[PDB]
Amino acid sequence: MTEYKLVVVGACGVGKSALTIQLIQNHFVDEYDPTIEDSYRKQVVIDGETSLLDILDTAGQEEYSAMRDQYMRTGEGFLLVFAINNTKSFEDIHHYREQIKRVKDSEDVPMVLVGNKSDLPSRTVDTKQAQDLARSYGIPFIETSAKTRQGVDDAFYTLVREIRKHKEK
Template sequence: GGGGVGKSALTIQLIQHHFVDEYDPTIEDSYRKQVAIDEEVCLLDILDTAGQEEFSAMRDSYMRTGEGFLCAYSITSRSSFDEVAGFREQILRVKDADHVPMVLVGNKCDIEQERQITSLE
């Protein structure tokens, strides 16, 4: 997702179990977490990427090595929602595949009063 949609906040919540409420733009941070999925232990390698356009040249590299993707947008930002389709297309192009594991994440649902994207969209 683009800058400011909450990718780092989601990652920190998953890894460290606390909510980060200040915005500190990320260039790249990586994390590891052991989880159980369908009773099988898995090791997640999580790459928290830069959302800002000035780091877009790094995206192809991230996408080439990734095995699954969370495409995040802010429910308070129409432009971040519109931008997600481009990220999806870029992932499919870089992976040279018709099907790549992806999950669309609508973030910032705690500020519902600022919602710009409907649940139906």
């Protein structure tokens, strides 16, 4: 069966765990321990293809090692998550993109920029700013809400379609 190794990255509190649980369980979590990093498998049909998604929700303390780089290198596609009400989380996207570039030795890694918490009225990051960054990286931008499920399937399925496009190259 076709397996896709997806990794959800971004700053603390942006909704990585909530997005992962909404995708896997169809449930919104108000609290998910920030020390729990784990991977979840889900079978899905995307464009007629039965796909096994293995989703790693990154967490814990910021720490680095050769072993951690070897592990992150196995990810096939990355969701770069920020929260639309947190400018710092948007500025932090650069760090996550550079760490993926560093470990993959490539400027062509499947990724999708995700602007989460789109249900909140307290926006500080304009959609145009996020589209401009995504255009600079050459990747799609998807607005999501783990709370209402807006854009969740689209964010993960678009990443899978980007991995397929990359594998065809």
